Amino acid sequence: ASMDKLRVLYDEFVTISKDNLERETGLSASDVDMDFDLNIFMTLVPVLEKKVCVITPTIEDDKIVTMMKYCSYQSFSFWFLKSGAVVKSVYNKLDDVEKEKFVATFRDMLLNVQTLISLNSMY
Ligand SMILES: [Zn+2]
Ligand SMILES: [Zn+2]
């Protein structure tokens, strides 16, 4: 986990999300606001942990895919209020190989974010 790694992870998340949301829905993505969206993920992590399980590097793929059902794209800068699609809607239309990468990207983003709600509670 690192600030520079998180930027690359977030940009991967947006690139895949954007390409799939655009062709699925016919609507065009908006400009990113990375800090706004990482704020959204910061608020989401505790909800995901209560509704599904604690996020650790060994969390099973099925628990991550279920967390994607509780992540609404309308919450983020690049899809802001455009449709009610959730992250699993993009997952469901990837091929098997692309699916594995998306799960890893979404899990590693949640771990990098969580590594920061952590730093923000240290005195
Ligand atoms: Zn394209
Ligand atoms: Zn901002």
Swiss-Prot record:
Compartments where located: Host cytoplasm; Virion
Function: Lipid-bound viral membrane assembly protein that plays an essential role in immature virion (IV) to mature virion (MV) transition. Functions in both crescent-shaped viral membranes formation and its enclosure to form immature virions. In addition, participates in targeting mature virion proteins to sites of virion assembly to ensure their correct localization.
UniProt note: domains: The N-terminal domain is not required for crescent formation but is required for virion formation.
Family membership noted in the UniProt record: Belongs to the orthopoxvirus OPG132 family.
Protein name per Swiss-Prot or TrEMBL: Virion morphogenesis protein OPG132
Gene: OPG132
Region of the whole protein represented: 1 to 121 of 372
